Design a protein around this ligand. Structure first.
Ligand SMILES: Nc1ncnc2c1ncn2[C@@H]1O[C@H](COP(=O)(O)OP(=O)(O)O)[C@@H](O)[C@H]1O
Length: 142
């Protein structure tokens, strides 16, 4: 057995607009991950900037923020064995052109400029990202 983990997932505005929330949810659920918190939201500039602070110096920072506030997102906490890595494996590489066939990014995105999904990349970032978007009373382990 591996540790039971929680990770923060975002279906970005591109995939929400494509109306493929359900298909992406089924990738998680069929992989053995459970949706334990969820909310559709529309991020403010400030919140997007805070959430992606780690990339504040990167050349893509401005574009990322404008993209993430361009329309509603679907945010969820995924729980299961090895959830953090499992989610990342389902998402695929940052660049959809380089992502493996069958990943969410390969299947639902075309360029790095709009790449469908976010997932926490480590235990530490998972904790911070979950607490950013959900109070613990609105996360329901099962
Ligand atoms: N060169 C780029 N141009 C536009 N957006 C980018 C670029 N690189 C990264 N991004 C955006 O910033 C997000 C976070 O970057 P990063 O954490 O490095 O990738 P990942 O989301 O695969 O963990 C990416 O998922 C993507 O939406």
């Amino acid at each position: 057995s591996m540790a039971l983990e929680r990770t923060l997932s975002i279906i970005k505005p591109d995939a929400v607009a494509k109306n493929v929330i359900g298909q992406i949810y089924s990738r998680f659920e069929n992989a053995g991950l459970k949706i334990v918190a969820a909310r559709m939201a529309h991020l403010s500039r400030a919140d997007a900037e805070k959430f992606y602070a780690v990339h504040a110096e990167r050349p893509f920072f401005k574009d990322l923020v404008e993209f993430m506030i361009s329309g509603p997102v679907m945010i969820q906490v995924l729980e299961g064995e090895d959830a953090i890595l499992k989610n990342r494996d389902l998402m695929g590489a940052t660049d959809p052109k380089k992502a493996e066939k069958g990943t969410i990014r390969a299947d639902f995105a075309d360029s790095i400029d709009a790449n469908a999904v976010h997932g926490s990349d480590a235990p530490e970032t998972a904790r911070v990202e979950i607490a950013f978007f959900f109070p613990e009373m609105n996360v329901y382990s099962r």
